[PDB]
Every structure is written in structure tokens, then in C-alpha cells.
Amino acid sequence: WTGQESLSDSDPEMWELLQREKDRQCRGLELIASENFCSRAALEALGSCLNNKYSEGYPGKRFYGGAEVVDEIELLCQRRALEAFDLDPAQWGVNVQPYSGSPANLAVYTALLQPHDRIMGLDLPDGGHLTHGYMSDVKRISATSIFFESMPYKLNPKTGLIDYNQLALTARLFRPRLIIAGTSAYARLIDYARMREVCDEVKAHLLADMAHISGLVAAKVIPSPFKHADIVTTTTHKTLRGARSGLIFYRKGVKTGREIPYTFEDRINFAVFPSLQGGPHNHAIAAVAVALKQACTPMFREYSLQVLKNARAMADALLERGYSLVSGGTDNHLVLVDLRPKGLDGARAERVLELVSITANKNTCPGDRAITPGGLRLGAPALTSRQFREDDFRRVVDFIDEGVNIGLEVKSKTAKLQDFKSFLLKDSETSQRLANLRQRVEQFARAFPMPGFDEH
Amino acid sequence: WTGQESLSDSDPEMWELLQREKDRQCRGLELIASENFCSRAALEALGSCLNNKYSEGYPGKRFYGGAEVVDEIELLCQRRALEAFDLDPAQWGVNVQPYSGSPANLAVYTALLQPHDRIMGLDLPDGGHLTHGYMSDVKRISATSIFFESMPYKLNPKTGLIDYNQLALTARLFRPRLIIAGTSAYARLIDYARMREVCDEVKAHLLADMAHISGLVAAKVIPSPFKHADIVTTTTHKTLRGARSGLIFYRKGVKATGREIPYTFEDRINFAVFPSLQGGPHNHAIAAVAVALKQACTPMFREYSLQVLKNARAMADALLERGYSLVSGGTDNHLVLVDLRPKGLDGARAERVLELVSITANKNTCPGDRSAITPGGLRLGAPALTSRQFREDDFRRVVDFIDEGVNIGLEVKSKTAKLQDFKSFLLKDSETSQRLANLRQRVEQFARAFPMPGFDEH
Amino acid sequence: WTGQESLSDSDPEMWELLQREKDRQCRGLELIASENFCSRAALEALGSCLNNKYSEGYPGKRFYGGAEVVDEIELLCQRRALEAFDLDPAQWGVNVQPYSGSPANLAVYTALLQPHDRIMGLDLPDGGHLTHGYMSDVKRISATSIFFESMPYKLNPKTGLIDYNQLALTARLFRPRLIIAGTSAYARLIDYARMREVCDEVKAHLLADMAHISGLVAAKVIPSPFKHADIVTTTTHKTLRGARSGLIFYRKGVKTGREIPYTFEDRINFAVFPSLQGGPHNHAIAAVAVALKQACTPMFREYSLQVLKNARAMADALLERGYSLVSGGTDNHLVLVDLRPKGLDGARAERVLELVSITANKNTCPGDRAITPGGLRLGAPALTSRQFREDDFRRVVDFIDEGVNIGLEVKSKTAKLQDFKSFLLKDSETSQRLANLRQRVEQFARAFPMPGFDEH
Amino acid sequence: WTGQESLSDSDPEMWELLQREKDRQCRGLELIASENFCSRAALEALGSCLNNKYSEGYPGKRFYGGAEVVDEIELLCQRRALEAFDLDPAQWGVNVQPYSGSPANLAVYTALLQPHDRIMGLDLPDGGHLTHGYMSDVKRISATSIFFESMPYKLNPKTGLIDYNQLALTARLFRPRLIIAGTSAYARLIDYARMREVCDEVKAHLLADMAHISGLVAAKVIPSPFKHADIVTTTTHKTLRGARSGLIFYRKGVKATGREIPYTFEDRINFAVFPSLQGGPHNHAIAAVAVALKQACTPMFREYSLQVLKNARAMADALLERGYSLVSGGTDNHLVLVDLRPKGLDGARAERVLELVSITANKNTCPGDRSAITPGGLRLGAPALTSRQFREDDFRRVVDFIDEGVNIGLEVKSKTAKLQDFKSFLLKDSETSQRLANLRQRVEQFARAFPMPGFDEH
């Protein structure tokens, strides 16, 4: 045993599962707004020997030796991070060790807030993320709502936009120590300047969580939250198209006559290690670094520009076929479809599209509160990486409308949701039209190229 | 732009760094106890298209669709995890989604405790890990100490062993809710039956953090903590020789007048991992973990684990018979806790001189040095070099390279006082820089001849 | 030394201070809405031998012996408490051991809530009490805001009333586990039914803190919060006219087919003792019992009826002289005067009236946020006990208008507040007119009878 | 209705209860260590018009006006409090507003600690008070245990004394922020210098809760904790013989390179009392406290306190020489901790038979009874009866009344098994009810002859 045997030969059971997944990604129409296809260059670094190095600590301040080159790798990742977002190293630092987006956000709260201090984020059904604090009416669900006291703010249901007015009203009463500007299911641009004004008024930190839009921010195709945010967290995948990891950006420098300094760097870095994490995943850090260099490229500006065009084309196509869009349209990479007008819930449309290899996710619509959410969240980044263009997404909307039509017919043939799901498998004619739509979807999808390796 | 361009063509500056790190890995003698060299099969799955799937939730109960393949990969990783540790799927479940060792522990505390509930772990300078609760005297350092109230139990300074008697005394008073039986710098087996007695008395949870010894437990080579513990957390690297990830083992079924009082661990542990703490699972890490878990079920891994112990005893005996004391005496696992206090050098000086000759170790506070900037000795591990087909004679040669290094360190220390004057000495003085560059050339020539798991060039 | 020597003979220094205070109460016009003059019968029990008995525990479940009669005293106090508020002993229990109003409220939070659980009360400048949670924008001030997380609700400044609408909006977002219905500076009737609806919607306990209005509730001259509240706390003084102590009323009995029981009694009683308090003050409990029997009397119904008439007469007199009243008037025992129209702040009017033996307290007016609050809180219970009637309070308003006029003249003669206060003492003519007003106030006040002892 | 009607005319049913309680107080032998009989002067101020003044805030910094007289009464109570304990007003301040002993402690924790900060007090069954932190094994009982994390230190079971050695060991591990040197059932002096050493080591606050011994400290009759403690809380009754209230003593001035690091206790303590925890002060209690504090400055109180000790030693020696063991051996303060385990009766049975003959004591868990429903012995105190002009011969007579009671209890126990069968026995059996009613008649005749502080009829 050398440890150099191929995965094909060493573990054939796992190799056949890698290939069944690679085929599923190649043949499916991937519309999950948070999914992207990582590049082969980054995957090489992700599955490299850097997994073998323990480098607890930070460059130059490591706890062990032999970190000579992984220090260069981490520092290179930090420089490429600041450059991909046009940041001044005198005004901004970055931590590249958060294992993912959720550990990044928990590190910020741990670094700046005391246990049970107050956090405000967009409510979960309104488009926020779990890590922004989420409690049901019966249970603290997000750990952010266990170690800290979270109170959500809401969309204005009439407009589909964040109710910056009600946020200002509630933040003055709730007195939060940190407010989160960032979304998972939101088709619009967050007014970071209005956020920073509410935060300055109530003496709170503004955290911009730009996981979904980071790739767009790096290409300068949408306004940068760095202009108004004290702290910026992000996933290194999604629109950034790297390996799954996280980043924390923070301010440095100067925040009677004396100059008050920014005090984020030491608290943030301490919260990641020693407080929360252990040994950094240097393989992820390296893969993140390759993607961050890919993001300063002109090809990323045109890809991100295409992501916007493709989402608008998908939105425009959806409106023409008679669909409703939460907040009317989109200014970023995703589209919030409201299917309650057309007579179908998102849960039904989710399963039907899943059976025809169209992966999307149900989404609560404003004024809906469920097991049967009324909407669908459709994303452009994944297919746009596969060189999709506007006409390609208009065809994607065609396949979706076919899928919705199939769901409408099954809805009249069924009572409850489980009757609906059971019908898509046992009924012969429904099974047939699904197979016909699925085959046309996969034939259309396989022709497009796919980032990464060819075999796995 | 296709995204299928090779890393060599796409990012040369990066590619050079992956090669330089591969070279330093190859040329060096890795003796850090937590290190290991991963198999090419696992790194193939680590850098797979599995990174491109969001599968929040759990198999059969996920939030997005299209997770049919990753559902089987997670379920496979679960079954391979139970089989690797000889567990009945009726008495044990496992969560394979923790991102690393530290997240796995935080999930267990979240799952079973309320904030500020009481926790007892081995003190950090006594060989415990940060995640077991480490407050200093001025600062709560570990996040375990902030969101929970942790009091440490100590080693007996006379024996180097865990003072199981003091732990029973201080547990009756501190009334902890969970005690952690796990180490990062401890050369002996842990009396898990004695922990379970103290835990059954104060009505506490017995969590076993076998991260450093996960491989030795799977190979049935040291006693298994699963016979006494309710919850077992582990890392998937170190002795398991996998990708960086974590696991949480928990008992399911019936605990015990009345009826069947059930084990309530599973739903709480799974809920703490998601949605409480983590987001989307790292399916590419879960797959590489599964790969390495299959490798741990095979007879080659038991012979590997048995070779780790022998190289450890060989390292200990070879160190004893050259003028070194070892706290706890010998070693019953994979590492040795050397005490450089009886040779006139400290751990900080020794690892800097050893690192300068491609020999990586780490300081470790020994039972006897209140000065923790100049710690007692070093922590040296076997599992890394053992994976390069090292045997006992190769480790007695490593001890010779080490003793030759500390003696360049004993001479360099006789000519200076403070540690930075020490360090600056090792770089400029031509007579010491030459004698270092010569020992370094001989260790690189010696290590390069051995094989190396993984790819050839990165 | 027998311990039976008179205070007159044993400690003459303290005796001369008792008499200087007795004279100050006899000669002053006491307008502090929370002040009342306790009856002699209760004071006898307050300064009795019951101070000498340790009775930790509860009647029948004491931790020591010899509690044979103090058990009868505590149980008698419980029966008179339930009877004074027309409560069914099958539906209501009462704890008579809270040392005061603040320990009563802290016992409720401790009994029903976990540390850091959420509380909502009327904001402090809006008329709430400290124990309802109060944080400045810099410090947690009330211990209620330290051991639990409080968020306040506000008055509607346009109307001076509680914004029950904004409370419902914020309670749905804040998700409090207990909401407090009760005030210190509020001239209106709290809509307890609307409170109970907000509490039932967000699954919160409704605590009615009726310290200021308890005497009115016992006389059935205003609606009883017991009709809508799960828990009722109160001080045993203020409008109840007893010794300084506290009471916690709670529900008993019944809150698939099974009957869910009320679970307040054991948690409330446990929070008082063993958790929070030590040995009960049986001397206070006994004095509280005499006052509670005085409250079931027809004389208390007419006294409380007179308290309402006197406050309305004081309010009507104030309006006629050109004063503003927060929320336009009053339906209870106090009056919130807004002096910002007449050109004087409450802090100035407070000191000027204090120098003429008219004790009131400054009060923040809605839309004012200070060291110079714009209002004055005037109460009727104290003087109404001294047999004041409507024409007497109209004369009190005359003395106040004279005092305000003196403050207006000093305001033009001075710059800052400290200049104002210093002017009332050093300036000769100002000092004179104050002495003339003070003498007329005290001559008018001394003629009225005074509950309690004659000498101390 | 004037409100000046007498209680006899206004509420006869109440008045009868005040008289019945006055009679039972007069007719009985009060031996509860925390009891005492207040002076008529203090009860005159307790039931004064001072109840009718809201004086939220502090002298010079109040929120209402018209507080000129109560400002001097509070300031007098402060000066009398410092003089009574021989404190320089430059090194000590005092807050006289705590409603009782428990509120005074909670204010100190609030003032100096954050929620869930660590606290160490004597364990409750070992003689500590609830307010020092008492969690059982199923429930946080004291509010000190809910809002703060408390670990108890124990007695040495072999000596009955505070195990100061174990406390130093468990303080280095628990890292407390505040340690409480105070007792409710402990017959020895507390090595406050040894507490200050343990506190100065783990960087903790030394709070002294002298509530049970406040009078003996003021009379310079036992060593004063003010020489070693930073904060001293006390009750104003018990040995101080005042109304029910509390005090918080704190150091002000300069603590200690650089300049004058100031004592920061005062503002935090005062702020915790108001506005944090309490509302309007009980000015009638503050005045009665001041009255009793002046009485404690006088030579009659030192002779009184000295008589308390002698009656305590007389009670201890008289109990020893009749077949009783006393934990800790003797007594150096005001109470005696008897152990009825070596005589075949328990504390629950003895206090029920003694209470039935107008002799009030209390159970106390002795060092040796895990069964705490049938506690070891009784706690008996001197300060109560000493205030009735009791001397040593009168206490040796009380011991005779006690020993005659336990022997009716040893015979009643030989004829039954469980405690309720015990209790029901003492009421129906004509031969035991007669023998109880005879001993009762002799104790009432004996106690009634002694004087009684306070009023004559209520």
C-alpha cells in the first residue's frame, strides 16, 4: 500500500457514485441560486497535499513549524481576496480560514458580541439566512438565536422589498449591537447606505453577508457593500465559483483630537482561531485563492455580466408566460417566482421539476407564512458558467412552463401533497410525459460544457 | 473560458506553491502527532464535482432536490463509519457532516447542553485540546469557555497520568453536565470505564474525543471508548488518514420500571449540526472521509496501526537510551511526550532548530514548566512517517537526527540567553548555519527515499 | 437595659428627626402620586413584635417551629387580600411575602422566565416603571434588563396613550415571554383586554403591575386587571395605604379532552422563598393585612371615589388656568401636567414647589426624551386621605400656579438650571415671595387631619 | 375616618393575633440562633411616619423633593453603621438601603459580577446560607445559582471545620470571581486571613457575610472580618438586635507603579441597590436600624455580646456533660451545633417535641447524615434569650429542659418508626400528651419571669 492508487482502482463503489453525480450535474438544468460549478484548477488545489498540513495560527504566528509555504499560500489568498474586491490593504484585512459561510458568520458574532447580545437579520421566510438568527414560534433553531438574541426584520409585502422604514423603527426599540445586511432569496439590491445609517443611529455594527452576490460584487457589476459595511462575510462558492469556504473582511486603520482605531482585526482573527476553529483547511484556502484570481479576470466581469443578463432574460421570459415575480423583477442573479397566481405551490413545482432534472427550490412568498410555499427561487450562476446565454435561459423557462403545466394537471387529479408526489411515480401517463420532458431537458443540457474534471 | 483548464496552465504561481509544499512534505520528517499523509483515492474525491452540490438537511429529509446521489454518498459514509468502529447500527448512529474536529465538538455541546451549562475537560497545558474548554486567567480563549462554563481536571504531576481521583472529587463539587475523555498530548490510554463511573455518579454525559487515536481504535489496536461512552467525536484525519472533516458518534435505541426509556441523542445531535450550526455540507469531504473509512476497515490498516504503536515504542525507547526523560514513562499509543528539561533545552528552542533541518515537531508544556513561553519538551508522533513505510529502524534513525539537533541547540544556547537571540543565532553565525545546513541535507536525503501517499506532483 | 425604654428617652437624636419629618408631612402639600399616609392601626402592627419571628417557608410548611400564630397572620393576610379584590380562592392565590413592589416583580420574572428571556414593558420616560425593564442607550440600568432581555413599548405621542397597535407589531417580532401591563406615570386606564389579546397571540404571560391603582381596583371604582391578567403584582402602599410591602396574585385551577392546570402557584412561591428572599417581614405582612381589611370597607370605596373626583378637579382646575394635560385629562388618581406650553420645565417647577412645601416630581412629556423634563406628575391619594375634597384641590392648583409664576420670573432672571436653583436661595425678593407662599401653603395644610400617630 | 384610630379599636381580630404572638414570645424559650427581640425604641421608629416617604435615590442625589429629613436619617444611619464597626469613613462606605439580608447579597453579586460569573460559598448543609449559592442535584434552588454559577466548598467531615485546604484547591480550578466568608450554622470563627489569601490568589473578591455575628463583631468581641474583606454584607437583626433590614459595607479610597488605583466598589454597589434591584427605600426600617446601631456603639452592647458568648459556652458545656456530642467540638461564637446522632434521636423529632413545649429550635444537617429529612442534630442560639437578661445558670436550666424533651422523644421513638407516626404520637396518646403538657407548663412559668424587650402588649 503506497497511498498512490487511483480512486478508480482502490474504491470502485465510491468511484461509481462520483460518476453518477457528475452525470447528474452534466445532464440537469441546475437552477439553485446558490449552486455553481467549480473550475478544474481550483479542484486540483482542493484535492491536493495541502490537506496534510496543520497550520493552526496565522502566517508568521503559527503554533508549529514547517508552515513556510502554506504561509505564502494563506497570505497570497489574502492579497487576492483584497484585490478581487478592489480593497485597500491599509483599510481592509481578510480572514481566509472560515470553513464555510456559516462558520464565518458565527466567528463575527463571537468576535464582536457577548453571549446573548442582540442581532437583527432579514427573517428567514422573507429571504434571510439561518445564520442571521432564526427562531420558530416554538424553538430556537439557528445557533445564532441560541448564543445571541436575534430579532428579525421583514419585507414590505406590498413591494417585495426590505422595509428599511420598519427596520429603523424596530432597531431603535430593540437596540441591536449588530445588524446583518445580506440575503439568500432576494432579487434586489440591498440599500447598504440606508443600513449603515440605521446602524450608526443605534450604535450597531453593520455586517454585510454577501454570500449570494459576492461574485457580482467582485466583478463590479453591482454596488459594493464594502463602501458602507464595517464587516463583510461571504462564501467562497456561489457566485464566486470557488471551493466551499468562507471569508471575513474587516476594516483597519482609523475609525479632543486623538484618532480612534478600528478594533476588528484582532477580535475577528482570535474568534476564528483559537476560539472556534482548529486547523485551517489549507486545501480549501488554496482552491479559494485560485478562484479569487479567476475573479479579477476580465472573463469574470463578462461572466457576471452574463449572469445578470441571463437572470433578467429568465425573468422577462417568465413574465411573458404569465408568471408573477416577487418585487416585480430582478437586479441580481436570481428570480423569485410567485406561482400562487398560476394555481400551483412551490413544493409541487419543486418535485415535478426535480423529476425532469430541473433542480430549483421552493420559496415562501411574501404573505404566505409552510409545507406548501407559493414560490420558486431560480438562479442563473450555475448554467451561466456552462456558457448559457439569454436564448438558452428563455428555453429553460419553456421547460419550466411545461413542468408547471404537468403539475397543474396532477393537482386536479390529486388531493393532498403526498397524493401529488405518489401520482408522479405510479400513474402511467404522468410518468410518460415526465420521461419525455426529462429526456428533452437532459439532451439540451448535456451539449453545454461543464467546468471541472471530465470524469468526476 | 471552460473551467476545465489545468491548474498548471491556469495559475502557475499557485501551482509552484503546491509543488513546493509537496517537496517540503517529501523532503521532511513529519513528526507532528496530528499530521498524516492522505491517500490519492481520498484526494481524488476531495477535489471532485461533489463540491458543486448544496445538500442542506439529511438523506431523505433535504431542502433542495436533485440530491439522490449525495444521499447515497452520505449514507455510505455513515455505514462505513459504523463498520470501521465495529458498531451495531441498532445501538449507534453517526453524523458525518461536521466540517472538522472543532465543529464536531461544538455541535455536541449545542445538541445536549444549554448555554453556560458546565463542562469538564483535560486542561490544555496538561494535554487537552482547546475545544474541551480553556480559559486562562485573563481571557476566555476557547469558544467552549464562552458559550459554556468549563472547569478543567488536571494531570497528577508525579505520574504524568490523568488524576482520575481529583477528577472524581472536583466533579462532585462542580456538578458538570458533560465530561470529555480525549487528549492531544497524552501518551497513555484513558480509563474510559473510570470516566463512565465519574459521569454516572454526577449524572453527566461522557463524551469521548478520540480524534488523535481514531485510527488505533478502528483497527482494534487499543481499547475502544465506544464500550463506555455515550457520544464519541473524532476528527477524520490524524490517525484515520483521511481528509479534514469530523464525525459525531451517538447511541440510538433504548437506554433502560415502566417501559423503554429511549436514547434521545440522535435528533438533538443532528439538529445541532444542521440547521443550528452549519450550512451546506462539504460533500466532497464526506466522500473522501468515506474512502478513508473503507481503507480503515481493511487488514492493511490494522497492520498500519500496529506499525504506528511499534514505531512509537521504538521512538520512546530510542529516546530514553540517549539521555531523555519521557513524561508518563513510556507510550501506549501513537506519540511520545519527551521532556527536554532534564537535558538543558526547552521545547521552543528544540523545535526551531529541528524545523530548520526539515524535522517538524511542536512544543508541549510538560508537567513541570510554569514558564510556557519556554515549554518543557516536544510532542513527537508516529502516524505520519509510518504511512511512508517507516519501520522501527527508520525511527531510531530519526531519534539520531533529533539528538544531533538538540545538541546543536545545547551549544547554540550556551552562547546566548534569550530565545530571540537563540533564533537569530541559528541564521547568521556561519559555523552554526553550516552545521545546520549539513544535518538538513542528510535528513532530506534520508526522507526522500521513502514513498509518499497521494499524488506525485501536488 | 430592658429594651422597653421609649425612643423619646433612649435616642433623642433620632426622635427629633422623626418629629421633623412628621412636621414636614403635616405642613406640606404632598402631591407625589405614589405617596400615601399610612393609618395608625397598620403602623402599630408594622412596628410590633412580629419583627422578632423568623418564618422562612409558608403557612404549615415552615422551616422552623413556633410559627403557630404568624401562620394565622400570613393566612389571614392572604384571605383579606383575595377578598379586597373580589377574588375567588378557587381561582386565585396570593403571596404576601414580597418585601416591596420591586422584589415582587423580580420574583415573577424569576418564577416564570429563564435568565435572558424576553420582557416587554412601557418605556420608562413614557410612564413605565424601572422594574419593567429599562436600559439607557449606554447601560443596562434595571436588573430586569440584566437577568432578562427587555424591549419597551411606547406611548402614541399624538394622543398620550399606550400605542397598543405598535405593541402588537413589536411583540410579534420581539416574541416576548411576558408582557407587563402597568404604569407609574399614566393618567389613563390600561386596556387590559387588548393586552391579553396580544399576549395570547404571541404566547406570552400578561403581568398586570397595578401598584399605582391597586386601591382604586379594590374599591371597584376602575376596571379590575384581574379579569384579564394571569399574574398581578402590586405594592401594598400607594393607593392601598398600607405599609411598604408587595403582593403577587396568580391564577389557580384549570387553565384530546384533558384539563390543563394553571402552573403559577408553585413557581411563584418558590421564587420568593427559597430562591430570592429570606425571612419574611411578618411585621409588614400584618400591617398589610390591616390595610387590606380597611380596603374592603365602605369608607375605602368613598375615599377612592374621592381620589378620582379630586384628581379630576385638579385636572379641571389646571385646564382652566391654561395648562396642558398629557392625554387631555385623567381617569385615575394622577394628572400629567405639560408645562412646556406655559414656558417652564418640570425640573424648575419641581424645585420651586419644593421650596414652598409642595412636593411633586418632574416627568418626561411625550416627545421630549432629560435634565429638563417638560412636565409634572401630580397625585391625589395622599391629600385625599387627609380629607381633602374638590374645592381643596382647586386651592392646591392655585398655590401651584403661584409657584409656576415665580419660576417663570426666575427663568428670565437666570441662564442655566444651576443659576435657577442658586437664585431661589440667594436673591432677596425671590426668597421673600417664596417664604410668603410657603407659609400660606403650610397654614392651609396643617389644618387638615393626618393619619398615623400624632407625634411621629 | 381619620386613620388615627388605634389597632385595638380598628382591627380586633388582628390585635388578638399580635397579643397571642407576644404571649408565645414571652412564654417561650427562643433558641433559634437567628432570632432576637427588638428594642421598643427601634419598633417605635419601625412603625413611624417614615413609611410615608418615597426617597428613591441617595442623599443629595434623589429623584423626588421634600427628602430633607430622610436625607439626614439615611446619612445618620451610615455614620452610625461605620462607627458601630470601628471603620474610618475614608476607607469604608456603607449602603443602608437593602431590604433584608438576602437582598444585600444579591445587590453585591449584581454590583460586582456579570450574569453567570462564578461564586463560591459554604455549602448549605455544611452551614452556609441559601444566598451563597445552593443548587441541588435536580434544581437550581437559590436565585444566586440561577443568575450566577456557584460551586460550594465543604466542611472537613473529620473536624467539623471549614476545609480551607480543599477550598484553595478547588478555587484554583473553578476560578471564582467572588468567595463568601459567612455562615448560618457554624460554631467557630472563620479564618478571614486564609480566605483573603485564597481570594488574592485566584484574583477573586472576598465578601464577608457576618449576618449571624454582626453584633459580636461590632462589640469587638470576636475578630472583625473588616481587616481582610473588601465587601461585608450583614443583616440588621439576629445579633445586632434591630429591625429586619440589611447593610452592605464596601471599601472606598485607594487600592494601590503609576498612580492611585482607586477602590471602585462604591458606585457599583450603590447602583445595584438602586436603580438596578430595589425601588423606594424603607425609611422606617433604615431609622430603626440606625437606632439599633447606636445601641451597638454603647458599652451595654459589649457586655451584652460578651454575655452571648458565655451563655453559648455554658450551653455547650452543659450539653456535653449530659450525653451530647457537638460538631466542631465547642463554640467560639453565639450558637452551638449539637449532634443528636450519638443519642439515638434526630433533629426533626427533637425540634417537634421541643416546639410542643414552647422551646423553638431548628434542624441542622450535621456532618454525617446523608438522610436530610431526618437531619443530625439541632442548632441552638444564645442571642435571643440573652436579651431577656439570661445568664449562664439560666442556660444550664434550658439544657435541662431540652434533655428532658429529647428523652420524651427517645421514648416516643422507641414506640414507633416513621416520622409522621412519631408526630401523631405526640398529640393523641394521653400519657405522652400529659408528660408534654407538664414540661410545657414548667418552661412557660420559667420564661415568663424574665423581662422582654419591646412593647408590653404587642
Ligand SMILES: Nc1nc2ccn(CCCCc3csc(C(=O)N[C@@H](CCC(=O)O)C(=O)O)c3F)c2c(=O)[nH]1
Ligand atoms: N431565504 C432562504 N432560502 C433557503 C433555501 C434553503 N435554505 C436553507 C435551508 C434551511 C432553512 C430552514 C428553514 S426551517 C428549517 C427547519 O427547522 N428544518 C427541519 C429541522 C431538522 C429536523 O427537525 O429534522 C424541520 O423542522 O423540518 C430549516 F432548516 C434557505 C435559507 O436559509 N434562506
Ligand SMILES: Nc1nc2ccn(CCCCc3csc(C(=O)N[C@@H](CCC(=O)O)C(=O)O)c3F)c2c(=O)[nH]1
Ligand atoms: N414613570 C416613572 N416615573 C418615575 C418617577 C420616579 N421614578 C423612579 C425613579 C428612578 C427612575 C430612573 C430613571 S433614570 C435613572 C438613573 O439612571 N439614575 C441615576 C443612577 C444612579 C447613579 O448613577 O448615581 C443617574 O444615572 O443619574 C433612574 F433611577 C419613576 C419611574 O420609575 N417611572
Ligand SMILES: *Cc1c(COP(=O)(O)O)cnc(C)c1O
Ligand atoms: C485535532 C483535534 C481537534 C480539532 O480538530 P480540527 O480539525 O482542527 O478542528 C479536536 N479534538 C481533538 C482531541 C483533536 O486532536
Ligand SMILES: *Cc1c(COP(=O)(O)O)cnc(C)c1O
Ligand atoms: C449560503 C449562505 C450562507 C452559508 O454558507 P454555507 O457554506 O452553507 O455555510 C450564509 N449566508 C448567506 C447569505 C448564504 O447565502
Ligand SMILES: *Cc1c(COP(=O)(O)O)cnc(C)c1O
Ligand atoms: C439570615 C441570613 C441571611 C438572610 O437574611 P434575611 O433577612 O432573611 O434576608 C443572609 N446571609 C446570612 C449569613 C444570614 O444569616
Ligand SMILES: *Cc1c(COP(=O)(O)O)cnc(C)c1O
Ligand atoms: C412604585 C412601583 C413599583 C415598586 O414599588 P417599590 O415599593 O418602590 O418597590 C413597581 N411597579 C410600579 C408600577 C410602581 O408604581
